[PDB]
Every structure is written in C-alpha cells, then in structure tokens.
C-alpha cells in the first residue's frame, strides 16, 4: 500500500 519511495 504505497510501499515505495521515489523522492528519497
């Protein structure tokens, strides 16, 4: 459920 990062 939104398990990722694009902007760190």
């Amino acid at each position, epitope marked *: 459920k*939104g*398990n990722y*990062v*694009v*902007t*760190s």
Partner: antibody
Amino acid sequence: EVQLVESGGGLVQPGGSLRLSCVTSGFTFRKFGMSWVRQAPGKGLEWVASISTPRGSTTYYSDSVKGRFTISRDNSKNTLYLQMNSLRAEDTAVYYCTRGYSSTSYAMDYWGQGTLVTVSS
Amino acid sequence: DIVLTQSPATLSLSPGERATLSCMTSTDIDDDMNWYQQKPGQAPRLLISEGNTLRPGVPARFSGSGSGTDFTLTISSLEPEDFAVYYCLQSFNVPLTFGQGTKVEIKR
C-alpha cells in the same frame, strides 16, 4: 521536448552480461525517478526496475531480474544505467528508459525509443 | 503482485464509435491507475495518470474513470489514429504491473 536515448543493446550469449545506458535531455534529470520497462517480441509491457531521486539510493526490481540486474544513475551525465548479468533467453526484449511523471510515482510519462537485447546461443 | 485484467482483449469498432476499455485489479489500488497507448513499432504514450488525470496534449475524447478495483478508459468517438493497443498500469505498489493489453481494431 523530453528525450530519452537508450544504447548498449545487442546480441549476447546466455550467461553473459550487458550494460544499457540511457542519456536524457529536456528536463532536470536529478529531480526525477526513473525506470526500465521491457517488451518481449510480440508481448506486452513488463516493468524491470526503478530508482529514486536524487542520488538513487533506493531501488526496486521485478522478481524476474532480482539479483541479476542493477539499476543506477549518474546525474552529472544525465545518464541512467541497467547492468544486466547472467542473462537468459527470456530476457530478450526491447528495453525502454522511462521517466517517473511525479515526485511520488514511478508511473512513466516519457519513454525512449528502446534498445533491443537479444539473448541467444 | 497485483494482477491487472484487461478486457476485451480485442475491441472491434468503426471510426466515430464510442470505445470502452476495462481494467480490473486483483486488489484495491485506490486511484493509482494509468493508461497508455502504443502503436506498432513505437514507444508507449501516457494518456491518463493517477486519479484519472488527463495528460496535457492528449485530446479530450480520452477519459479515465473508476477507482478501487474496476477502471475504465473511454474514447468518446474513435478517430482513425486511435486504432492501436492500450495498456493499463497500476503504480500503487511495487512491483509495478501492467494489463496484457487491449487492441482496438477496425470492424468490417
């Protein structure tokens, strides 16, 4: 306009290695997430890997390529890479460099023309 | 891994007709659905992004609707250049997953 230009594709024997490069223009590269998506001959689209912005410390891979492929970036060269090791026949496909459209999504807006990778003995 | 099921795999229509393309997901992905167009020999083009957001430059005849598990791409009136393959993509979770495509072809 935005341009993504892939290179480094070609013929390779099973078990071999290739490194794809994608040189970008038309936007501030360091500000965007980037992904590789591939398309096998006559087949649909399949996501391969994604990398965070700006440094690219955070990366994601499909199970099909986990442990074999490595995505990386060089912001000073506007370049995205895909290191492909231990290649197999089923890795044959056109490989697309793509840009994540937002600061929070890898959903692609711009795509390169793609580079063909053929794995065969 | 979230599965996207597109139907019908082939949509047979004539220019001028309304096209309805369906994408169903194996689980609730909120509104993180995206739609692409691909013509033979060409790279895909983004038509609609998360939240059924129409991309700048895309003709108004394209529109996305739905959320949760049932999504629809509508082409209000088909132009000759609209006959192509369309893919859906969920960007809710990794791995990012695509539908297997719907081909909009010429009926005769």
